[PDB]
Amino acid sequence: ENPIFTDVFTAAPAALVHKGRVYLYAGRDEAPDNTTFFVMNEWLVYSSDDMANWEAHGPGLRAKDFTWAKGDAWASQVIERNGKFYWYVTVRHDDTKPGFAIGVAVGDSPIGPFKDALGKALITNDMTTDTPIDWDDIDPSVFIDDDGQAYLFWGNTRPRYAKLKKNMVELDGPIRAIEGLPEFTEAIWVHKYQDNYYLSYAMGFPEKIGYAMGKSIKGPWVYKGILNEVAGNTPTNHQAIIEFNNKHYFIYHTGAGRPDGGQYRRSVSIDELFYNPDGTIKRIVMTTEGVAPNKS
Numbered sequence: 001e002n003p004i005f006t007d008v009f010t011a012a013p014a015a016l017v018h019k020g021r022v023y024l025y026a027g028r029d030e031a032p033d034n035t036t037f038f039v040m041n042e043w044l045v046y047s048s049d050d051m052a053n054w055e056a057h058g059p060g061l062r063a064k065d066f067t068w069a070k071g072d073a074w075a076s077q078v079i080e081r082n083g084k085f086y087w088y089v090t091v092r093h094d095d096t097k098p099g100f101a102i103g104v105a106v107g108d109s110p111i112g113p114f115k116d117a118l119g120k121a122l123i124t125n126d127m128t129t130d131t132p133i134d135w136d137d138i139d140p141s142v143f144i145d146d147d148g149q150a151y152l153f154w155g156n157t158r159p160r161y162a163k164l165k166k167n168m169v170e171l172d173g174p175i176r177a178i179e180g181l182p183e184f185t186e187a188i189w190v191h192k193y194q195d196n197y198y199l200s201y202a203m204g205f206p207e208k209i210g211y212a213m214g215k216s217i218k219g220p221w222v223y224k225g226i227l228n229e230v231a232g233n234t235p236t237n238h239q240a241i242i243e244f245n246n247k248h249y250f251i252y253h254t255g256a257g258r259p260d261g262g263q264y265r266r267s268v269s270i271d272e273l274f275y276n277p278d279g280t281i282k283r284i285v286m287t288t289e290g291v292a293p294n295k296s
C-alpha cells in the first residue's frame with residue numbers, strides 16, 4: 001500500500017536495478033511541520049526483489065559528508081558504471097561558493113559506503129548565471145547513452161545538461177540550455193525505452209509531471225503532455241521511472257503520510273507505468289493500493 005514507508009518521511013526518490021534487485025534512494029524529511037521549510041540531512045537506502053517488499057538499509061549518505069557543504073540533503077540520483085556507484089547530490093554549498101550546488105559521491109556497492117568523489121562540488125552556483133536565483137543548480141539526473149557518452153542533466157527553472165567524462169566526476173564539454181520543456185520547474189529524469197528518449201520533469205507550480213520525447217539524448221525534445229497530476233497533498237512532484245521484471249514503475253512522493261504529512265513531510269509511493277503502442281506514456285493513475293509483487 002502507498003505510501004510504502006510508514007516510520008519515516010521520504011522524498012525525491014531515485015532508483016536503479018542491480019543484480020535482480022531494485023535499489024531506492026530518498027531524502028529523509030525531518031521538518032516538524034508543513035509551515036516552515038524542508039529539513040533534510042541524510043538520504044536513506046532501500047531495496048526489493050519484487051517492488052512490493054522493501055528492506056531498509058538505513059542512511060547511505062549525509063549532506064555533511066561533503067566538507068564543502070552547509071547541509072540540505074536535496075534531490076539526488078545514483079547510477080552504476082564500471083562496477084562503481086556514483087551518487088549525484090544536491091546540497092547547499094558553504095559560503096565560499098554561495099548557493100546550491102551539485103556534488104558527487106562514489107561507492108563500491110549500491111549500499112555504499114559512499115564518499116565524496118571530488119572533495120569539491122561538481123557544479124557550483126556561479127557556473128550558471130542566466131538566472132539570479134541561487135537554487136537553480138539542484139536536482140541532477142545522469143544518463144549513459146548507447147555510444148558510451150554520459151551526460152549530467154539538472155536544474156530548477158533552467159533545465160541544462162553537459163557531457164560527463166568516463167570517470168563520471170568531471171564535465172567534458174560546455175553546459176547547454178535545454179529547449180522544448182514548457183513550464184519547466186525541476187526534477188528532470190531521463191530514460192530510454194526502445195528507440196525513444198524520455199525527459200520527464202516537474203512542470204508548473206504546484207507541480208505536475210510533464211514529459212517530452214526525443215529521438216536522441218540531445219533531442220530535439222517534443223513535449224507530449226502530462227504524465228502525472230498534482231500529487232496528493234504536496235506541491236512538489238518528484239519522480240523516477242525504471243523497468244523491472246518486464247514491468248515499468250513510476251516512483252514518486254506524496255504528502256499523504258501520517259501524522260500530518262504535507263509539503264515538508266513527504267512519503268515515497270509507487271505505481272505502474274504503461275506505454276502506448278506509439279511510445280507515448282499513459283498518464284499515471286496514483287493509487288492507495290500500489291503495485292503487486294513482481295518477483296523473478
Ligand SMILES: OC[C@@H]1O[C@@H](OC[C@@H]2O[C@@H](OC[C@@H]3O[C@@H](O)[C@H](O)[C@H]3O)[C@H](O)[C@H]2O)[C@H](O)[C@H]1O
Pocket residue numbers: 134135156157185186205236
Ligand atoms: O514559486 C514557484 C516555483 O518554486 C520553485 O521551484 C520549486 C521549489 O524549488 C525548490 O526550493 C524552493 C525554493 O528554493 C529555496 O531556496 C527558495 O528559498 C525556495 O523558494 C524546491 O524544490 C521547491 O519547493 C521555483 O523557483 C518557482 O518557479
Ligand SMILES: [Ca+2]
Pocket residue numbers: 124125126127128129133134136137
Ligand atoms: Ca546558478
